[PDB]
């Protein structure tokens, strides 16, 4: 279930930077953010 989450969230990161495609570092930042939010409860 978290893989769908990381795919959903990786788009918002490109949205913030006003881009048109999704780079790999966006994926990894989304990965770390999901790990971190899961680390709490």
């Amino acid at each position: 279930a978290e893989v769908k989450g990381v795919c959903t969230e990786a788009g918002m990161y490109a949205l913030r930077e006003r881009r048109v495609h999704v780079t790999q570092e966006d994926f990894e930042m989304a990965v770390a953010k999901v790990m971190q939010k899961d680390s709490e409860k």
Binding site: E25, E28, M29, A32, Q36
Partner: protein
């Protein structure tokens, strides 16, 4: 019995207050044997409290780097891992002010494995920021446009130092 240690620390403090740099080096070259008479913690604290202020005071083109060299060597001797980690980080940051090219990359590259395998994550932020700055200052814009972001990544997660986010920004 212990009064001479406090006197040494007072002399170092006064040398920093008045604005002298050579006398710190002279005391450090005159006091290295004396360490082998006190507890390890007291000696390590004296070494750290001397090197911190010594390097902080200013920059000397000839005196400064050998002090860090000898300190890393003595820590390698006494076998304290974290002390050597901190001193090595201080040295790798010290290189850039002297405008070096290669070694500032190699030392940090070596340090990354051990640092990322241990407990702390703040030093990850420090070495990543240093690597980013040295990449940018050596006219290689492609290389550095990624490290900084991952360092901010580790930082925003769990962090406590105020001076870190400002420099990152």
């Amino acid at each position: 019995v212990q009064v001479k240690e406090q006197s040494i620390l007072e002399l170092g403090s006064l040398l920093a207050k008045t604005g002298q740099a050579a006398e710190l080096g002279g005391l450090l070259k005159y006091v290295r044997p004396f360490l082998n008479s006190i507890s390890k913690a007291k000696a390590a604290r004296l070494v750290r409290s001397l090197l911190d202020l010594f390097l902080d005071m200013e920059a000397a083109t000839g005196q400064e780097v050998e002090l860090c060299l000898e300190c890393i060597e003595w820590a390698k001797s006494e076998k304290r891992t974290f002390l050597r980690q901190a001193l090595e980080a201080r040295l790798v940051s010290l290189y850039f002010d002297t405008k070096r090219y290669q070694e500032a990359l190699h030392l940090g590259s070596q340090l990354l494995r051990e640092l990322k395998k241990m407990d702390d994550k703040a030093l990850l932020v420090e070495v990543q920021l240093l690597e980013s700055k040295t990449y940018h200052a050596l006219s290689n814009l492609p290389k550095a446009r990624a490290a900084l972001t991952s360092a901010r990544t580790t930082a925003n997660a769990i962090y406590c130092p105020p001076k870190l986010q400002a420099t990152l920004d």
